[PDB]
């Protein structure tokens, strides 16, 4: 009743195996309070800025950047929709063509935080000059505690 | 140079992010669909704390 | 037929005031090209420097 | 002379990344210190 609860606590005091089993039960119950897995998902476009302010670079500046954590193995799947394009970031040593129907993978890991610029490096029309690339790199704890909370529905 | 070529695949770790890059006329598109899960950080200290909370 | 507005002298003076500093929308700003401008590895950006 | 300049630049890069690791080891020690402080608070929270 209540003494049997107290007798269970006395058996916790006495038997080490029962103590370990109830510790494992405590660990099972604490994992039940852990929130479940949630999906992170986004789909945005990145366009060149037509007019820039001081502190921004003409031709190379976009409106929406790609935010990537540092010290993390990142897979980049590159493809296209209509013609050939090339995703080139010269500071990160990645330049791989975007082919319609292909899914070209890149393994990338960034050493330091910063803002890295790029352009498209495959001729694709009249406005080939005006498809720039900007990658913003932040720390992994910021990425996993603040940035991914912007994409929880 | 051959050694640098064969080092371009670096899949010897647990991958942490996937980003789908799509090239259009004339702009870029970025996609992601992953899952965020949480894990109790060093639970055995909490296990012992609960153990000494229940023993008295 | 088109001389861009980032080459005018007012833009150039306001850019020279900022320097080679890139803003970030999720983090404090960062110095661009930290090796050729010899920023030390303890300093990441101007706002995070906070000079003594 | 060219390889001397290259080795000089690589030396600066190695010192840069060493300083960055020295800095990055400092916040993560203070983070675990704050975690231990919260653990010491939760310890007396279940004993009072």
């Amino acid at each position: 009743m209540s003494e049997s609860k107290d007798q269970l606590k006395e058996k916790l005091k006495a038997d080490p195996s029962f103590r370990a089993e109830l510790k494992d039960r405590i660990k099972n119950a604490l994992l039940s309070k852990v929130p479940a897995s949630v999906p992170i998902s986004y789909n945005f476009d990145s366009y060149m800025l037509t007019e820039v302010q001081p502190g921004q670079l003409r031709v190379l500046e976009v409106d929406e950047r790609l935010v990537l954590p540092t010290n993390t193995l990142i897979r980049l799947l590159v493809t296209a929709s209509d013609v050939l394009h090339s995703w080139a970031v010269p500071a990160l040593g990645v330049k791989m063509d975007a082919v319609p129907g292909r899914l070209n993978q890149v393994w990338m890991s960034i050493n330091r935080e910063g803002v890295f610029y790029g352009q498209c490096s495959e001729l694709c029309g009249a406005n080939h000059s005006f498809m720039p690339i900007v990658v913003e790199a932040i720390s992994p704890r910021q990425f996993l505690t603040e940035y991914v909370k912007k994409w929880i529905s | 140079s051959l050694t640098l070529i064969y080092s371009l695949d670096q899949h010897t770790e647990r991958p942490g992010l996937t980003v789908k890059i799509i090239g259009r006329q004339w702009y870029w598109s970025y996609e992601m669909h992953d899952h965020l899960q949480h894990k109790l950080l060093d639970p055995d200290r909490l296990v012992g704390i609960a153990e000494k909370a229940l023993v008295k | 037929t088109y001389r861009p507005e980032s080459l005018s002298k007012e833009f150039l003076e306001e850019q020279a005031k900022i320097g080679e500093v890139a803003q970030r929308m999720n983090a404090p700003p960062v110095y661009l090209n930290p090796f050729t401008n010899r920023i030390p590895g303890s300093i990441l950006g101007p706002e995070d420097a906070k000079p003594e | 002379a060219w390889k001397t300049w290259h080795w000089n630049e690589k030396r600066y890069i190695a010192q840069y990344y060493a300083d960055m690791a020295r800095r990055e080891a400092r916040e993560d020690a203070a983070r675990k210190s704050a975690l231990a402080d919260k653990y010491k608070q939760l310890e007396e929270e279940l004993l009072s």
Binding site: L57, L60, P90, A91, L92, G93, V94, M108, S109, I110, N111, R112, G114, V115, F116, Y117, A137 | S1, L4, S7, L8 | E20, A22, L32, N33, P34, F35, T36 | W2, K3, H6, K10, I13
Partner: peptide
């Protein structure tokens, strides 16, 4: 990270692979 006026060589790097490429180029 970004190109600079009157620049001769490559840009600065943030991956070990890009640094290794530049090292190979200087060796050649």
């Amino acid at each position: 990270d970004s190109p600079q006026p009157w620049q001769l060589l490559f840009q600065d790097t943030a991956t070990s692979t890009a640094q290794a490429m530049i090292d190979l180029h200087h060796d050649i």
